C-alpha cells in the first residue's frame, strides 16, 4: 500500500499516534483543532476526563500536528516510565494489581502505553498470559489516556 508499515515499532508507536491523531485531527491537516479533539475526548477519554484533558494540553497548544504527538509524548513522562513507573501507575490509576507483576516482569516499561493498538494488535497482549478484555480495555483506555494527556 501507499501507507507502508516499516517496522513493528512504528506500527505500534506511529500508528497508535496516527490513529489518535486522526481521531482528533480528522482531517489530519496537521493540527488537532481543539474542537476536533473534543469529539474523541467526549467518549474515549470521557470514561476518565472530558474537558480537562483539552484544558491541560490544549491550554494554548491546541493545534497539535501528527509529528507533534511524537515529540510531545517523547518529552513526556509516559514514554520515560520504566517498569516501576508503569506498574505503579497501573495499580494507582488502573487499579489492576493482579497483573502488575506480569507486565513488570515480562518487561513492561513505558512501552505498551504508546504501543497499544486500538484496531491493530497491541504489544501488552503478548506480554500478558491472556489477551483478554479487562487487560486490553484497562491498558488501551489508560494508555490512550496517558498518551493523549501526557
Ligand atoms: Ca484538523
Torsion of CA 132, 85, 92, 107, to 10 degrees: 20
Query: How far away, in angstroms, is 42 Cα from ligand 1 center?
Result: 17
Nearest alpha-carbon partner for 71 in 14, 7, 145, 137: 14
Q: Which grid coordinates belong to 114?
A: 504508546
Query: How far away, in angstroms, is 143 Cα from ligand 1 center?
Result: 23
Residue 31 and residue 65 in contact, taking contact as beta carbons nearer than 8 Å: yes
Residue ranges, comma separated, of all CATH 1.10.150.50 domains in the chain are 83-150
CA distance 148 to 114: 9
Q: Which DSSP category does 120 fall into?
A: S
Residue ranges, comma separated, of all CATH 1.10.238.180 domains in the chain are 8-82
CA distance 144 to 45: 8
Instruction: Measure the CA angle with vertex 12, ends 6 and 16; round to 5°.
Output: 115
Residue 116 and residue 143 in contact, taking contact as beta carbons nearer than 8 Å: yes
Query: How far away, in angstroms, is 35 Cα from ligand 1 center?
Result: 9
Residue 63 and residue 33 in contact, taking contact as beta carbons nearer than 8 Å: yes
Query: How far away, in angstroms, is 27 Cα from ligand 1 center?
Result: 5
Residue 110 and residue 86 in contact, taking contact as beta carbons nearer than 8 Å: yes
Residue 147 and residue 78 in contact, taking contact as beta carbons nearer than 8 Å: yes
Give whole-number Cα distances, 74 to 55, 80, 85, 102, in Å: 20, 8, 16, 25
Which residues contribute to the annotated binding site for Ca(2+)? 25, 27, 29, 36
Query: How far away, in angstroms, is 29 Cα from ligand 1 center?
Result: 5
Which residues contribute to the annotated binding site? 25, 27, 29, 36
CATH number for the region 83-150 comes to: 1.10.150.50
CA distance 10 to 147: 15
The environment of the single-atom ion ligand 1, i.e. residues with CB closer than 5 A, is 25, 27, 29, 33, 36
CA distance 93 to 49: 13
Q: Which grid coordinates belong to 122?
A: 497491541
Query: How far away, in angstroms, is 114 Cα from ligand 1 center?
Result: 21
Technique that determined the structure: NMR
- Buried b / exposed e across 54-92, counting CB within 10 Å, b at 16+? beebbeeeeebbbebbbebbeebebbebebeebbebbee
- Domain over 8-82 is classified CATH 3.40.50.300: no
Residue 140 and residue 116 in contact, taking contact as beta carbons nearer than 8 Å: yes
Amino acid at each position: 500500500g501507499s501507507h507502508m508499515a516499516s517496522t513493528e515499532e512504528d506500527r505500534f508507536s506511529l500508528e497508535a499516534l496516527q490513529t489518535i491523531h486522526k481521531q482528533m485531527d480528522d482531517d489530519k491537516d496537521g493540527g488537532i483543532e481543539v474542537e476536533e479533539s473534543d469529539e474523541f475526548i467526549r467518549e474515549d477519554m470521557k470514561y476518565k476526563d472530558a474537558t480537562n484533558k483539552h484544558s491541560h494540553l490544549h491550554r494554548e497548544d491546541k493545534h497539535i500536528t501528527i509529528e507533534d504527538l511524537w515529540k510531545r509524548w517523547k518529552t513526556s513522562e509516559v514514554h520515560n516510565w520504566t517498569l516501576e513507573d508503569t506498574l505503579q501507575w497501573l495499580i494507582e490509576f488502573v487499579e489492576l494489581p493482579q497483573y502488575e507483576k506480569n507486565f513488570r516482569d515480562n518487561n513492561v516499561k513505558g512501552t505498551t502505553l504508546p504501543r497499544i493498538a486500538v484496531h491493530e494488535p497491541s504489544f501488552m497482549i503478548s506480554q500478558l498470559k491472556i489477551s483478554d478484555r479487562s487487560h486490553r480495555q484497562k491498558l488501551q483506555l489508560k494508555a490512550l489516556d496517558v498518551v493523549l494527556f501526557g
